Amino acid sequence: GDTSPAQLIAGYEAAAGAPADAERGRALFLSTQTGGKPDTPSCTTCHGADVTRAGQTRTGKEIAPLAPSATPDRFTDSARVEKWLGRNCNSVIGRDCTPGEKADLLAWLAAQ
Ligand code: HEC
């Protein structure tokens, strides 16, 4: 694509002022939130708790696995990551994700 997963995470770490923490990324992805839309309390609502398996939209359509081990071109387009993180962080958490959250989330997801 136009980027690597490491280039994306390094850009978020620089904006956050701190290195990514994959354990924090895992905890946020699996968390149940209450600030967003009622139908999407968690990232897992659509991507599941195991991102090597397919996910599902709110209507039951299949979403390709988020793990790069299952779907190889993941996180290789910078605009596509921002586009989905913009929409999905707002739906789940109710606000954009911070650069530190994005760094943490991608560092966990990029290793799956
Ligand atoms: C359903 C309403 C979703 C919720 C809740 C979350 N995501 Fe999602 N995500 C969804 C779709 C339909 C898509 C696009 C289709 C695809 O196969 O990519 C995505 C995509 C992403 C991506 C982009 C991956 C890439 O190709 O670079 C990321 C990084 C992502 N989703 C992360 C993510 C997080 C962190 C979420 C909780 C805040 C989350 N998603 C929720 C559908 C839905």
From Swiss-Prot:
Molecular function per GO: electron transfer activity; heme binding; metal ion binding
Post-translational modification: Binds 1 heme c group covalently per subunit.
Presence of the UniProt keyword Transport in the record: yes
Disulfide links within the chain: C89-C97
Domain of life: Bacteria
Binding-site residues for heme c, renumbered to this chain: C43, C46, H47
Keywords: Disulfide bond, Electron transport, Heme, Iron, Metal-binding, Signal, Transport
InterPro entries documented for this protein: Cyt_c-like_dom, Cyt_c-like_dom_sf, DUF1924_SHP
Functional description taken from the UniProt entry: High-spin cytochrome. Transiently bind oxygen during autoxidation, which occurs with a half-life of 3 minutes with a 4-fold excess of O(2). Also binds carbon monoxide, azide and cyanide.
Protein name in UniProt: Cytochrome c-type protein SHP
Species of the source: Cereibacter sphaeroides (strain ATCC 17023 / DSM 158 / JCM 6121 / CCUG 31486 / LMG 2827 / NBRC 12203 / NCIMB 8253 / ATH 2.4.1.) (Rhodobacter sphaeroides)
